[PDB]
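Record format v2
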Amino acid sequence: ALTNAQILAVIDSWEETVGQFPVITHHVPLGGGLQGTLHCYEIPLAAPYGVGFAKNGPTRWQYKRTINQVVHRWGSHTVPFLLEPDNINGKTCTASALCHNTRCHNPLHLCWESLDDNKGRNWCPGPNGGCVHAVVCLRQGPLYGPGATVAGPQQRGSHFVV
Amino acid sequence: ALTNAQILAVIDSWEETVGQFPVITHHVPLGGGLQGTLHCYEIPLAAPYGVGFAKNGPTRWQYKRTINQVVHRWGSHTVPFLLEPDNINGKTCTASALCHNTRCHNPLHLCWESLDDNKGRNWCPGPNGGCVHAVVCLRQGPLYGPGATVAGPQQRGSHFVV
DNA sequence: TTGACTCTCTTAAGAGAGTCA
DNA sequence: TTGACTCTCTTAAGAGAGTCA
Ligand SMILES: [Mg+2]
Ligand SMILES: [Mg+2]
Ligand SMILES: [Zn+2]
Ligand SMILES: [Zn+2]
Ligand SMILES: [Zn+2]
Ligand SMILES: [Zn+2]
């Protein structure tokens, strides 16, 4: 809602509901050849999802609360950060999933940062492979690797230099 | 349609024209605190751009050639790879700017890979900072670094465990 | 045959708000 | 009030195709 006490109340009910989502253990690469364990609190695959939650997309949900007879709605992963600035250097802050598991709503697996910072974690070597993110990664990004480039830089003539 | 020989001719005329674009010297980070030099062949900011070139968007261009009365058009950065496979692992190949300078059309600064591989280079530590791309980056990604996260993983209660 | 404009679309990380019951 | 659906938009790396003289 608008007041501090009202925002805290929204975060508390959200945490309580999400706290009852089934907990699934995920073993993940940490980088450096090491492996770790994450406990994700996953929103159900189909309705009902939990008090206040509704699906607006294949893997998108929203949390709804009616405060003073007026309904308020937020992206399901954004609630933990309702008291933080919604922007940073003119860029919109976004709920970034450290566990790379969209169904997970564990706030201990989420951070609040620019979309660019958010995306970049997909290629991070991980907490044990060189991660330099100030708010450390929980695991190596799923896209980290040598890649599969079909063709590299090349020229037929001699008009260019690197 | 166009024979192998005709495609080669299109690549040759494209190189001839791009080679005459202003050549700008840029000093860039390579990772490991090292600085390097990259020479970008930059398409003009406004028309005319060069023979065969036209702007279809703020930072998008196309290359056009008419062969035997039929007009052919390609994304401006895609020409170097016309004789290469156009997909890999079920993913479309895209022109990936190793120099991270959109206006540049220097073929020695481009590679052909998936959009995910392409995007990830934005966060790479660089050829001198740990790059593991099989087709090595020319410089450290512009977005590499500690990031600027506003809020980290947190909970108000004790419903969660990482 | 060309140049200089016009328009909408793809991905995969993220969002907004409306219609019914 | 609360649930279960519907639709489209944003970002920044990338695209294809039409009009007119
Ligand atoms: Mg993410
Ligand atoms: Mg790129
Ligand atoms: Zn999780
Ligand atoms: Zn990281
Ligand atoms: Zn360049
Ligand atoms: Zn690299």
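Residues 47-49, 51-56, 64, 66, 69, 71, 91-92, 115-116, 119 of chain A lie near DNA strand D (CB under 10 Å from a C1').
Helices of chain A lie at 4-18, 115-120.
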